[PDB]
Amino acid sequence: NRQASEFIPAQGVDEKTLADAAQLASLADETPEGRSIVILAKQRFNLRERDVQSLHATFVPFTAQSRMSGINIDNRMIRKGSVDAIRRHVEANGGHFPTDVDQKVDQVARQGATPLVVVEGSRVLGVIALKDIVKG
Ligand SMILES: Nc1ncnc2c1ncn2[C@@H]1O[C@H](COP(=O)(O)OP(=O)(O)NP(=O)(O)O)[C@@H](O)[C@H]1O
Numbered sequence: 404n405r406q407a408s409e410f411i412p413a414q415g416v417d418e419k420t421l422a423d424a425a426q427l428a429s430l431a432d433e434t435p436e437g438r439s440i441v442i443l444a445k446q447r448f449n450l451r452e453r454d455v456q457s458l459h460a461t462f463v464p465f466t467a468q469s470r471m472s473g474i475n476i477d478n479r480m481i482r483k484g485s486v487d488a489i490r491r492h493v494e495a496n497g498g499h500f501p502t503d504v505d506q507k508v509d510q511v512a513r514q515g516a517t518p519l520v521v522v523e524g525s526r527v528l529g530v531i532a533l534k535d536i537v538k539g
Contacts (some may be wrong), residue, residue: 404519404536406439412529414503419448421529425521427453428481431462433512434473440483440531480524489520489527498525 410421422444429437430452444450455462458476465472471484471492482492486508490500504520507530511518516532 405533406438407531408534410529410531411507413527416528420536421521422447423499424481424523424528425483425531430455432465432487434465434472437465437472450532470523483519483521486518486520489522493522493525496525500527504530
């Protein structure tokens with residue numbers, strides 16, 4: 404299986420902020436890995452999932468075809484998915500993928516992890532490296 408092990412902020416982003424957005428944007432995904440990330444911040448920050456309907460917010464379902472899930476709330480929007488997936492989401496909003504964030508995604512892969520990318524609105528806040536539960 405795949406689980407988030409570490410997250411890194413994008414260009415000018417704080418690591419704590421990145422872990423938090425990955426957690427709430429995963430509350431809406433029904434994939435088992437989306438729970439793996441909600442754990443990742445849990446052990447690192449010891450925080451709890453955020454109730455979207457208590458904020459009158461919305462969950463954004465996770466689809467594998469785009470490889471993306473997220474969450475919407477009355478003051479923010481969050482999206483997370485594959486690096487190619489997030490780049491397309493930013494361009495549709497009209498945002499851009501910062502070089503530093505693309506570099507963090509690649510170093511996540513060069514390290515044998517699956518780099519997901521997380522954005523807020525149309526800009527990437529950080530990249531997430533997942534360790535593989537199973538490895539040959
Ligand atoms: N909680 C999540 N939210 C957004 N994206 C995720 C999440 N978990 C994983 N992803 C990314 O979405 C990709 C999965 O997309 P996809 O290839 O369509 O599913 P899949 O791996 O074939 N499904 P499975 O058969 O269970 O492995 C993963 O490789 C991650 O990079």
